[PDB]
Amino acid sequence: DGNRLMLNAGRGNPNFLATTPRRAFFRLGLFAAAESELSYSYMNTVGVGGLAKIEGIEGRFERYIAENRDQEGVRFLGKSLSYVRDQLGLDPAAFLHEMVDGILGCNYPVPPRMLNISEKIVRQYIIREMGADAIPSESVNLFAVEGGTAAMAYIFESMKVNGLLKAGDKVAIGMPVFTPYIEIPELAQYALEEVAINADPALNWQYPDSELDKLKDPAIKIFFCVNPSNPPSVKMDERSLERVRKIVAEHRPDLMILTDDVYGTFADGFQSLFAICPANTLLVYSFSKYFGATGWRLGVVAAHKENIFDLALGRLPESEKTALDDRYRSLLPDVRSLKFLDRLVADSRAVALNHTAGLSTPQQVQMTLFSLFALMDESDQYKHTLKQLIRRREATLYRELGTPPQRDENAVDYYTLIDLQDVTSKLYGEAFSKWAVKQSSTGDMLFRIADETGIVLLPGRGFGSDRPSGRASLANLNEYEYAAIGRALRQMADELYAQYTQ
Amino acid sequence: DGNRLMLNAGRGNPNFLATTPRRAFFRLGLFAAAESELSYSYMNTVGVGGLAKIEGIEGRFERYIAENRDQEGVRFLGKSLSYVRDQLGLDPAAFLHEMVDGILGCNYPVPPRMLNISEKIVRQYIIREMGADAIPSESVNLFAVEGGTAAMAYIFESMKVNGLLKAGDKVAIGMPVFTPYIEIPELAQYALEEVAINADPALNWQYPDSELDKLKDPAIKIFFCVNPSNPPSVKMDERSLERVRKIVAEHRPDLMILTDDVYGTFADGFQSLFAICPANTLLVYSFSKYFGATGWRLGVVAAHKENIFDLALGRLPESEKTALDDRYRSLLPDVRSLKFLDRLVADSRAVALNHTAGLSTPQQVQMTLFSLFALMDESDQYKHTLKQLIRRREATLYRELGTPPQRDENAVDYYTLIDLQDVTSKLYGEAFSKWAVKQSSTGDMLFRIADETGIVLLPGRGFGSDRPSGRASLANLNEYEYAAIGRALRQMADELYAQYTQ
Amino acid sequence: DGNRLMLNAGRGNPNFLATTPRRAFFRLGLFAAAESELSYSYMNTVGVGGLAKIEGIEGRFERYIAENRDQEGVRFLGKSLSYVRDQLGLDPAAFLHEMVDGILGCNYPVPPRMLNISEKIVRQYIIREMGADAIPSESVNLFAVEGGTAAMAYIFESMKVNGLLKAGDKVAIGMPVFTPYIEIPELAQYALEEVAINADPALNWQYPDSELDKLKDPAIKIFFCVNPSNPPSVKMDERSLERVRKIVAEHRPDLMILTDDVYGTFADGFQSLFAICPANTLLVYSFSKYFGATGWRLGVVAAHKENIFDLALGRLPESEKTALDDRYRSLLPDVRSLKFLDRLVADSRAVALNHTAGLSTPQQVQMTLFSLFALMDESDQYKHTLKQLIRRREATLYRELGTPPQRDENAVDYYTLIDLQDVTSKLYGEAFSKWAVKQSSTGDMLFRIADETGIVLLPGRGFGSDRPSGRASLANLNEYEYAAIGRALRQMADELYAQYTQ
Ligand SMILES: *Cc1c(COP(=O)(O)O)cnc(C)c1O
Ligand SMILES: *Cc1c(COP(=O)(O)O)cnc(C)c1O
Ligand SMILES: *Cc1c(COP(=O)(O)O)cnc(C)c1O
Ligand SMILES: [Cl-]
Ligand SMILES: [Cl-]
Ligand SMILES: [Cl-]
């Protein structure tokens, strides 16, 4: 399943996971279960509870924390309350009841877009990790969704439905990008045309100015990028972000930006395009990778309250405004005041079902607890732990290839590129590396590792020339498995060197 | 929020919830958390775990159950294992690891449609509650989705995409139905035409043969019904099910049926249209109402392995088959073998994202635990408890209107119709009831209750004549609130009688 | 072993068992162990105790119950004391010491026939479950034996020894009966002649009046029947019991009746022939099936204090009375006052060993605890639980054969008859069922299930015509195993229908 996921979906699945916010969730659940039972009125039954009451919830919660000081999840829950009440200044009783009611999953999400306090908490996390601090928190709204996967499906459908993207429109795509994102515009369902914004291996996988300038073409309605990138696993540098900023400000104030920033926390000092061009950007952030929460399906779509999506909607042709008046008629009297972010919500479940739309309340609670976990960790201990783990696995991989590729300030390294030439160069000089590349390819490299270790790697391209290389995730295997990849690739190189000399 | 949900979405939200399977979930979570920590290799860190190991899981689980015999959730978990292993004959280690891995939400759902053992467990529950026992379990497949809400959105979109429903096609809709289901075909996005299959108040809200025969019109491609009904809250009787069966067998073997059977468990001896016409029916079942789990967003789409949806797909015009070959190309070599149920899955997240599609693994685990809860309860104690609760609230409501409407074998009563004429008839004779109806309407009835009690009711129509009536849910309020509705409606009747006499 | 038991012994072995009276037994054992240690006088030894003292036993027992309120077995023991003392009016100290001394197995059973208080307790259970309430409790005596198996061996041997049954005497046997009971009279050791009292499939396996009238033949000395029957699994109806009653009263006051009523508790409102003709009947009751206690070997022989066995003994020819005077000489001065029930006891172990004869004291204690368990359960919860379990397994079996045979008021259903004709009739009409029977037999039916499922069934006959049928026990398998039998038998029927049509 780990090997099959990389081939099919270009992921990625970590073998680590955040335990403390998970324990806090299950412990909160036991508290909420007791809260439900406090509202059950009848004798001689079993298995039926009532709704949790907001009245006196703080005092009951405080007792629960005091009696269970020995439980890690409970201590976390205790500090979470302080963080929300004391640092965020939010209503403590309202926070607790939203969490209790939320984890019970006994009420339809209200509002459907996101639960009130969860939105306020999660956006603090999002703003911080995206480097978007210069934007007032109150100007950022979130739509809680079933991972980045759901976000992308919802966004393209709403773009189509609301006439923001039309058949024949050009979508610029920062490349190399993983397979799934190439196909969605290529669907006849959308019939969009791709323009490649190509990263340069000579610039260490940054986008050249010349490539970024392609965005000046007014036929290009949207810039779509994974940042930090996947496969290449680098973050857009200061120059690149500035270039986009100037292009938007100077030439294309109408350019929509769709940015997928799931790997952000794995970079040093990450800054999102959302931070740089908030009015022009829809941010997709997934909790999957950082918290080891792929199965939880936790994501948000973020939008600035003043954005070009709502501006474009006000500039639509009359026939389209009339069609949308009909579409959203049941939702509100004035459809023209219905914002794009809330249209995403309505479009996600056929409009008529808007009031039972949204991410499940226990999922939002869990998302909120992951968010708190990271926010309360001021010295970034969890982040550093994961980074040290990733570096250890890297050292182990390149042990006999030695050693790892040199990493700059823009490095992410969730993924690593094992380049045959660079490896054979490090081992046996420049002359040998030129020859070794002409002998074997990516196929012979990936098939050998697979046969020796049972691990299949991603080809390392490209698009390029088929420079013989493979990509491994530093997130999904254990040390001896990275050591076995290195050993198999070292024997392959050693046998090439014995076929070099003689 | 309770009053606002009935007006907007025609629900419904229960104030009861199943506690035991929820406690089992949170307890399983604590076990899984410990399982994750067993795979963590490093010192001097906190909050990071590894992946749960299948090896020796039974023995560890058995210890967990033995040490926590005093915990209700744990005892349930213990019996669940026996039920799965002993009664269902499934692999106990594989069940446990699916549940442990599932609740950790650390792996993408695999397969995306449903987790393997969860599917087998949940379909046992579905088949039993739908009265579909005559169908072999192995011939029923499920797609786990975000409630009935997601199911409906997914189904219509896939119908459109795969050319099973086309603009101008007629959709027959069993009525009265709640608002949301009237609007989805009416969307320009689908441009479908509605044909009303009208329930008869004289038949106690059953569909007359003459109304059911409307399905013979070959322009009608789908029969769409909520069964048991909402608002009317009755199940289709033996005659009605037989009529549809003959119509499908005799005249319309091509008729698709879409049935929403969320209220099934609240009827006595429920039998689904899925049981009667499995080859022709897509079953939508929601866990929301029965388990008090609206916020969990838990539903399945059920299909027979041999169905008319796949048959129609094989009979599509060549241009459509060519378009679908392109659409699903990345999924499998032979797109023509891709079944409609799996197309729902692929269509739910844009095709290219099929391998990260599906309901979150902790949601499927919770769904599995609700399913087990009901399956293991042989004497149906929970079902009876809820029914007694509903009846008590009914008795309390009609206490001063006295007494409740007579209920037949097809009665559900999650909702109750408070008919002014019938109430005033029971109180002051037939002559007075005829006059009292001409004086006040549904509006004056609903506005009075709202002003006196703060509870807003649904109008009781119709479509009919505006016979002055209101609908209350027996699931969402407490006893004194039902008593206050009765009292307000009794004083209204008493003041009408003092304006009658004089 | 489960499959091998049905073929060899015509059983039957349940996969359920009564746990509470078993836990009570083991808990009582720990109390008794401590009682023994209270009588041990010496230092510096281990593993040796003394005899439990009756003095102060109530107070010590009451402390034991109070300290162990959390133990299910102990709570049962506590309520047992109340039942014996308060409802039965028996000596509480004497009850406790009999139980304590009994479970220690440190004294020879005294008296050998049954322990005093155990007899009083167990007969209350027997009288109730046999519907024999009209008989005063004090007029019923029991001989505790090693299951019904030992009872039958003991009874025939004593019948022979005491000249109540002689070579060439006719034994009437209610049939169909299971194999073991056909062979015991056929032994040259007894040389008895069988007369078949045949049950009628047209009467749903009741004995016709014409068949019951066969008992008028004065050459028939004993009527031997399993009631409720095995294999057929029905109880004798009101008419049948009345017929025997009149035959005994009117024509055959000398007719001995031997009735085996092990399945009694699985019928609704069971009434034994012992209840109807107590003076003429020896009742054999086994605890094996109802309590899931086959390995415990627990049975009683019941006799009325005024019976025709003792009457016949007084009418024996002088040469036989002289021989029996010699045989029983050591037992009592007046052998002619030695009752048949006590002769069973003496005959069971060669007469000279009468005073070390009888069922082991821990077995009698366990029997007493099973008896209490059922007596104290006023709402018959355990009985209903087992019946619901049996019905669930039946529903699961006939799921695809659908559905189960219609059951009347005389139904027991521990066993179920799977009739090919009736099954194929229910599925494909009367015409097909006539043909399907001519194609395959019982052999082809039983061998197919065995090969597909690994379960071997009993042939369903007869004696009859070999109507193609099989018998399954609803007591010995789990749900998926019944489901696999149904599925194998459905595919067999479906392939017959494809060989019917074409
Ligand atoms: C892993 C990954 C995601 C996260 O997907 P979810 O559906 O949120 O789990 C998003 N984008 C990219 C490019 C990824 O590699
Ligand atoms: C409540 C209800 C449902 C359940 O909705 P979910 O989205 O599954 O919570 C489905 N159909 C009808 C008609 C209802 O009233
Ligand atoms: C099972 C059974 C018994 C019980 O036998 P024990 O020796 O008491 O276990 C007695 N009679 C019949 C006909 C049976 O099937
Ligand atoms: Cl914890
Ligand atoms: Cl618990
Ligand atoms: Cl115990």
Side-chain angles (χ1 to χ4, degrees), chain A residues 11 147-149 178 181 226 230 260 262-263 286 288-289 297, chain B residues 108:
Chain A
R11 286 136 157 141
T149 293
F178 82 147
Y181 289 172
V226 174
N230 174 10
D260 177 346
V262 63
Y263 297 107
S286 169
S288 294
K289 304 298 166 40
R297 322 277 59 236
Chain B
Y108 287 106

Side-chain angles (χ1 to χ4, degrees), chain C residues 9-13 146-152 177-178 181 226-230 260-263 284-289 293-295 297-299 414-415:
Chain C
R11 286 136 157 141
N13 211 105
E146 305 81 351
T149 293
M152 291 311 178
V177 72
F178 82 147
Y181 289 172
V226 174
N227 177 45
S229 58
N230 174 10
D260 177 346
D261 298 21
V262 63
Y263 297 107
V284 172
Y285 181 82
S286 169
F287 285 74
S288 294
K289 304 298 166 40
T294 50
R297 322 277 59 236
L298 301 179
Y414 186 102
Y415 303 98

Side-chain angles (χ1 to χ4, degrees), chain C residues 197 208-217 243 247:
Chain C
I197 314 298
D209 294 319
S210 54
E211 289 290 314
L212 288 169
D213 283 2
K214 293 183 180 195
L215 295 168
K216 290 169 164 183
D217 176 7
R243 193 73 176 193
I247 289 171

